[PDB]
Amino acid sequence: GSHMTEYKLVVVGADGVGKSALTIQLIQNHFVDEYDPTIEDSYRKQVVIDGETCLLDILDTAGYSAMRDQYMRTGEGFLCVFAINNTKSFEDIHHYREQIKRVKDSEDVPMVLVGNKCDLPSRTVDTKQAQDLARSYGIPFIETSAKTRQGVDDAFYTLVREIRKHKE
Numbered sequence: 001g002s003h004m005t006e007y008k009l010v011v012v013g014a015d016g017v018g019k020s021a022l023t024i025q026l027i028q029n030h031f032v033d034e035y036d037p038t039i040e041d042s043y044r045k046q047v048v049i050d051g052e053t054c055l056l057d058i059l060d061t062a063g064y065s066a067m068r069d070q071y072m073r074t075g076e077g078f079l080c081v082f083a084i085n086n087t088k089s090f091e092d093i094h095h096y097r098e099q100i101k102r103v104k105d106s107e108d109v110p111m112v113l114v115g116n117k118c119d120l121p122s123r124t125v126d127t128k129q130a131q132d133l134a135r136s137y138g139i140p141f142i143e144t145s146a147k148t149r150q151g152v153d154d155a156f157y158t159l160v161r162e163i164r165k166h167k168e
């Protein structure tokens with residue numbers, strides 16, 4: 001074990017749900033207020049998760065996909081993000097999950113369902129409803145806010161834990 005483990009994480013979900021804001025909060029502890037649409041960006045951070053020192057490589061995606069399928073197939077695990085005030089983004093999750101399964105050609109891909117913007121009033125997606133969908137996929141569910149930092153570390157770390165379960 002002179003080899004440091006590297007985990008390739010990919011963040012997916014509809015446009016505007018907070019994929020970039022989550023990632024930038026994780027890396028630089030900074031909340032981005034401005035909406036700046038992403039094409040494809042990558043980040044890297046060394047962290048300790050359950051006592052294991054590892055390197056996270058994080059691919060932040062856009063919310064015409066020969067190129068997209070390829071960079072998706074590099075991913076070991078996926079954060080599937082929706083915003084709790086955007087019903088359509090929640091409905092889109094099924095489609096992200098199918099896209100992941102298709103490109104990985106696997107029915108068992110490490111994944112975490114993230115409900116973001118939980119600092120905002122007037123949620124349209126209830127906790128129970130998201131919890132139940134996660135249950136039907138057999139994956140964890142976490143409520144997050146890129147603005148307050150609620151759930152940020154826990155979302156990425158939980159996904160690493162799912163990857164470790166997968167590797168056995």
Ligand SMILES: Nc1nc2c(ncn2[C@@H]2O[C@H](COP(=O)(O)OP(=O)(O)NP(=O)(O)O)[C@@H](O)[C@H]2O)c(=O)[nH]1
Binds near residue numbers: 120
């Ligand atoms: N209140 C609040 N606003 C958020 C949160 N997360 C993101 N936002 C806001 O939502 C907007 C879009 O966030 P951004 O991270 O760019 O979304 P994205 O999913 O990366 N968009 P794209 O798919 O185009 O790249 C920004 O104005 C940002 O400040 C959150 O947890 N709470």
Ligand SMILES: [Mg+2]
Binds near residue numbers: 036
């Ligand atoms: Mg973005």
